[PDB]
Amino acid sequence: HGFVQNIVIDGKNYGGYLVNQYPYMSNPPEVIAWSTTATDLGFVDGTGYQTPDIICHRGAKPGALTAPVSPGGTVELQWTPWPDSHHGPVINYLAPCNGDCSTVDKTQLEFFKIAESGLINDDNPPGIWASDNLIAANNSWTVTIPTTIAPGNYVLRHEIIALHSAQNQDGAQNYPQCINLQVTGGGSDNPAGTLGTALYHDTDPGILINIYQKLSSYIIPGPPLYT
Ligand SMILES: *[C@@H]1O[C@H](CO)[C@@H](O)[C@H](O)[C@H]1NC(C)=O
Ligand SMILES: [Cu+2]
């Protein structure tokens, strides 16, 4: 359990959607991060993959603001402390807003994968995963925005999937966190995008998996990495 408390871009903090504060507030602040109703700090499991919930987490609505990013710039996402138990991949996607991200129909966003990290080492099952890399980085993840994509407004969908329960049908725990970015620079690619509700299926080989046994490979779920 947890969520993104803060985002660092070009030497300032953009405060995240504080799901354990702003839903109790009823005149909460304008932020670059999407609001959610996920006040339990929990997840979208396999029962929700073909529901709107998977796109930017449960009952999610677009952030009011958008952060500019320098060409090939870094986005740093700071999480609440991530439990070692919650072993699994860290995956990042962009979807174009084609306009102000604050007014998009989330059910219409088409995501391309810009980065993925899975099982790093399996010397001691269940092993070292992207999630353990995230813990070792003091619960922060650094995304580099590609220089080769068309500039304009996009949603960054940033996700940990915990696999500690994933042996069981619908046991995997997806923690998607969305923010609004204004990508800048000279790129022109419009990558093939995948609907939120076509990212994952509850029987994917990297979703329905016993991590506690020796693994020879791990298939990072979702569509193919853009480069
Ligand atoms: C994270 O920072 C704290 C101090 O703020 C430090 O004590 C901790 O051990 C650091 N990093 C890791 C990888 O544990
Ligand atoms: Cu949890």
Residue numbers in the entry: 1 to 227
Publication excerpt:
Lytic polysaccharide monooxygenases [LPMOs, reviewed in Tandrup et al., Vu & Ngo, Wang et al. and Eijsink et al.] were discovered just over 10 years ago and are metalloenzymes containing a type II Cu centre. A Cu2+ ion is coordinated by two histidines in a motif known as the histidine brace (His-brace), where the N-terminal His is often Nɛ2-methyl­ated in LPMOs of fungal origin and coordinates Cu using both the N-terminal nitro­gen and the Nδ1 atom. LPMOs cleave the glycosidic bond, producing both oxidized (C1 and/or C4) and non-oxidized chain ends. Here we have monitored the Cu-site geometry in two AA9 LPMOs, one from Lentinus similis (LsAA9_A) and one from Thermoascus auranti­acus (TaAA9_A), as the active-site Cu is photoreduced in the X-ray beam.
Additionally, we have solved six structures of the C1/C4-oxidizing AA9 from Thermoascus auranti­acus (TaAA9_A, where oligosaccharides bound in the structure have so far not been obtained) to identify similarities between AA9s as the central Cu ion is reduced. TaAA9_A has been used previously in describing the LPMO active site in theoretical studies and the structures here could therefore present an improvement for further calculations. Crystal contacts most likely prevent binding at negative subsites, assuming the oligosaccharide binds in a similar manner to previous oligosaccharide-binding structures with LsAA9_A and an AA9 from Collariella virescens (CvAA9_A), and it has not been possible so far to obtain an oligosaccharide bound in the structure of this protein, which also has no reported activity on oligosaccharides. In a previous EXAFS study, it was indicated that the Cu2+ structure of TaAA9_A could be well represented by four N/O ligands at an average distance from Cu of 1.98 Å, whereby one of the close ligands was lost on photoreduction, leaving the Cu atom in a T-shaped coordination. The equatorial ligand distances in the lowest-dose TaAA9_A structure presented have an average of 2.1 Å, which is within the agreement level that can be expected given an estimated coordinate error of 0.207 Å for this structure; however, in the crystal structure, an axial water is additionally very close at a distance from Cu of 2.0 Å and is significantly closer than in the LsAA9_A substrate-free structures above. The equatorial water mol­ecule sits at 2.2 Å from the Cu atom in the lowest-dose structure and reaches the longest distance of 2.6 Å at an inter­mediate dose (1.13 × 106 Gy).
